Design a protein around this ligand. Structure first.
Ligand SMILES: NC(=O)c1ccc[n+]([C@@H]2O[C@H](COP(=O)([O-])OP(=O)(O)OC[C@H]3O[C@@H](n4cnc5c(N)ncnc54)[C@H](OP(=O)(O)O)[C@@H]3O)[C@@H](O)[C@H]2O)c1
Ligand SMILES: NC(=O)c1ccc[n+]([C@@H]2O[C@H](COP(=O)([O-])OP(=O)(O)OC[C@H]3O[C@@H](n4cnc5c(N)ncnc54)[C@H](O)[C@@H]3O)[C@@H](O)[C@H]2O)c1
Lengths: 174, 366, 362
């Protein structure tokens, strides 16, 4: 019933990875963590790690919501990818840093035909080595439904605010 | 079977229900795409690139729709009662997909019914996650929100971004967005990136987070701190008085646009300012705005362009074409060239207005 | 010692050589400031705001320069030959400062001369650095660059920023800026802000790094403050590595210019005719011949599926910000010569700020 984690943890998980792809969502924007994320990334690919962004079409609360924020923080266009031209890369990825996402990764979209989020395509974060969720609590997202991916083998719960929590994860990663 | 796209005859409507990318997908689904020539000129889609995609070109509207089993367009077809009978051109028994504006245009719905046409009014699309790729309401409103800032920048005599120069400093433009739906969100985004100091206000309290998620500053009478709290409009006025560009996006389905800026208010504003009323086609959020023109009183340019999305027809169109295609694809099949709409599909039951001679949709007094 | 600011009359001019911040500072120097009523309408500067600043308001333009010892204006005065002799109002024996457009308007230089008026053409300012704060070229051309991306965006049927949406991805507008000077750099900045993918080229070497630190990507082709011609052999080598990007470009802003000469041709028909349909070209050099032949001053031209914009007096399309700035350029030029309480302008003469600026000083 849910595994939790801390800044140092995540710092470790991601620091010793080959491929890590970010997954910004409405959370990442409520906390205005564009830059903190842009940092954790350039000093992740500084070690040598492989970084990319998985922008899901309805991420956030408006069309292009993650796009404007990432752009404000200067994340190179060629690092940002759309749900389709990248969903196949999670399989061969060590970590899926889900900073602010939730409903966008919920597998109940492919499964439980009883759900409100049924049918909507999603990024394959579950098909990744290890998941790294971030969120102030255990509340649901827009849809208002628990994301089962929340508690399972490689799913972490780095509870807290996205800007702070990403700011610390940057810190303990020098 | 045969699907066809005509040119948009309604005045000041440069959009088109098609795109190269989508032609190729339609073809791929066993269709025979036909499009009236020059139907995408205003959207920068040439018959050349349109054919190069897999689509045949027709000389006239009449000829394109001639014998199509499925027809797509952006605005509802024109009836005989309007001067041009396009609905007449559509083949009897055909399928029509477009922005019908059904619940607000009983006539066209009836016109279509005569000819036993089956119409799916895209704007009635259900709000359900798996259909966000089918929502034309947000795809277009989104580009219109973008456009308001651009139109606003255009009419304002100062730059948006603050600029420190050798000759001195010029302060940032201040924007105030009323209504935080999709259009207003993209507005805040576009204004901020340009460098404006954006403020936003909306009666739905859940709005504060959204607004802040874009860098905005929600307007609140927080003497309190989330009788007649009606003096909320005094916090607003306090900000509107320092505003340079004010963008109003409040809209209600089937009812007149709710006044958001009283003339009594446009007076208290500063000379040189401009108000963008995306609600103009519905009475406007500002009673001074006039459908199609930029009126000036009290020193404020109250802009009221109509069909804003069309002002971004080059992008508006392909998005719109994708909405149509995503709606249709799940119904095309083997029979290897026939389409069937399972009535169990909510997407089909809430979008359909009339089927084979009979207005079906509940809300339409039948 | 009075100094007044009339109301600009030339068509389309909404700028004014004055602002509250500067009136308060001119009063401080000892001048009584007189401004024509309504003179600030276009620049949104109100009469009441100029009043509270310390200036005096004049009922008519006629009554304005009527006693003014020094006159500040944006554009060069209109001779009787142009419509209504303004040089005829300027109290004979006074000093007039403004964008006189000296070098290419001898007819005005002689009109002010019969009035025994001393004028300083602000565009002739030396390219020396202690003059940045006096350069009306830079202050105005800086807002022009901003306004280009805007006008460009207004005429473009697409949106600038990339947006991944439920209906597909709207790709980023690709902008190309010809001439990375002051206006070019601002255009690059403003274009990037909106989310475009900016491309830039210029003949000057330093240029390349400035483009890289603003976010742009330099298109490497192949002087006391600018550049000279490059010759037909270069222009060719240019259009060669330019065209490659020019085909994918959505908005192209040309700003190249060449001291006392005609604007360098940068985008020929053979080239516009190779751009994607719907594209837009903003020609900021149009009043000097443009960098693209097709452009025509004061009008937008559609040809070959391209929109070649070419407004005139772009800085006036940003009047409200251009004014304060132009106004301060004047204040910074004048102040070093107003002598320590003597209510008199002793223009240093040996000062290159005064030498290469004064056209007539009867
Ligand atoms: N794209 C659009 O235009 C649009 C429009 C309408 C609806 N939607 C819907 O909204 C969803 C968007 O996808 P999403 O992944 O972003 O889903 P959500 O919107 O479902 O996910 C929100 C995530 O952010 C967290 N959060 C809130 N404040 C936070 C903070 N300060 N720091 C860190 N986290 C914070 C939430 O939980 P905590 O509160 O526990 O932190 C949660 O983990 C989709 O379900 C879509 O159907 C999208
Ligand atoms: N006194 C001062 O402080 C001062 C005043 C003015 C200009 N400057 C300096 O001068 C430089 C430029 O000033 P400007 O913007 O006013 O110049 P400008 O407006 O006359 O030049 C515009 C641009 O045209 C470019 N250009 C001309 N022909 C070209 C061709 N064939 N191909 C490509 N590019 C071509 C120029 O090199 C320049 O960058 C800047 O680096 C600026 O700082 C300094």
């Amino acid at each position: 019933s849910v595994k939790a984690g801390s800044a140092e943890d995540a710092a470790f998980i991601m620091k010793n990875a080959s491929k890590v792809i970010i997954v910004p969502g409405y959370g990442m924007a409520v906390a205005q963590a564009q830059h903190a994320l842009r940092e954790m990334a350039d000093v992740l690919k500084k070690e040598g790690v492989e970084v990319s962004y998985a922008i899901h079409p309805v991420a956030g609360r408006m069309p292009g919501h993650m796009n404007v924020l990432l752009a404000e923080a200067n994340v190179p266009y060629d690092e940002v990818f759309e749900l389709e031209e990248i969903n196949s890369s999670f399989q061969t990825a060590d970590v899926a840093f889900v900073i602010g996402a939730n409903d966008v990764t919920n597998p109940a979209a492919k499964t439980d035909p009883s759900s409100p989020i049924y049918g909507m395509p999603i990024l394959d974060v579950e098909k990744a080595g290890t998941v790294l969720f971030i969120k102030r609590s255990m509340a649901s997202g827009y849809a208002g439904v628990e994301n089962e991916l929340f508690f399972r083998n490689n799913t972490m719960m780095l509870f807290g605010d996205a800007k702070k929590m990403t700011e610390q994860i940057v810190q303990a990663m020098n | 079977m045969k699907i066809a796209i005509p040119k948009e005859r309604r005045p000041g409507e440069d959009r088109v229900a098609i795109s190269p990318e989508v032609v190729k997908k339609l073809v791929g689904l066993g269709f025979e795409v036909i499009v009236e020539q020059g139907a995408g000129v205003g959207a920068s889609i040439t018959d050349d690139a349109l054919t190069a995609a897999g689509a045949t070109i027709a000389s006239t509207a009449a000829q394109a729709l001639s014998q199509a089993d499925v027809v797509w367009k952006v605005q509802r077809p024109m009836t005989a009662e309007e001067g041009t009978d396009e609905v007449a051109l559509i083949k009897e028994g055909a399928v029509l997909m477009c922005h019908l504006g059904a619940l607000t245009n009983r006539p066209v719905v009836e016109a279509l019914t005569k000819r036993k046409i089956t119409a799916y009014a895209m704007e009635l699309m259900p709000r359900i996650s798996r259909a966000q790729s089918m929502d034309i309401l947000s795809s277009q409103s989104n580009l219109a929100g973008y456009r308001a800032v651009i139109d606003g920048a255009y009419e304002f005599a100062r730059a948006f971004p603050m600029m420190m120069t050798a000759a001195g400093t010029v302060p940032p433009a201040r924007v105030l967005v009323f209504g935080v739906g999709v259009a207003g969100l993209q507005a805040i985004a576009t204004a901020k990136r340009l460098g404006a100091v954006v403020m936003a206000t909306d009666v739905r309290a859940a709005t504060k987070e959204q607004v802040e998620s874009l860098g905005g500053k929600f307007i609140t009478v927080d003497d309190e701190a989330m009788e007649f709290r009606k003096k909320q409009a005094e916090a607003v006025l306090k900000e509107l008085v320092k505003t340079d560009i004010a963008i109003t996006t409040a809209l209600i389905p089937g009812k007149p646009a709710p006044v958001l800026i009283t003339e009594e208010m446009v007076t208290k504003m500063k000379p040189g300012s401009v108000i963008i009323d995306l609600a103009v086609e519905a009475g406007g959020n500002c009673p001074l705005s006039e459908p199609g023109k930029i009126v000036v009183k009290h020193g404020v340019k109250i802009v009221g362009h109509t069909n804003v999305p069309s002002r971004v027809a080059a992008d508006a169109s392909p998005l719109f074409a994708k909405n149509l295609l995503n709606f249709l694809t799940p119904h095309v099949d083997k029979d290897t060239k026939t389409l069937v709409m399972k009535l169990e599909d909510e997407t089909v039951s809430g979008t359909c207005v009339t089927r084979d001679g009979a207005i079906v949709h509940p809300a339409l007094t039948g």
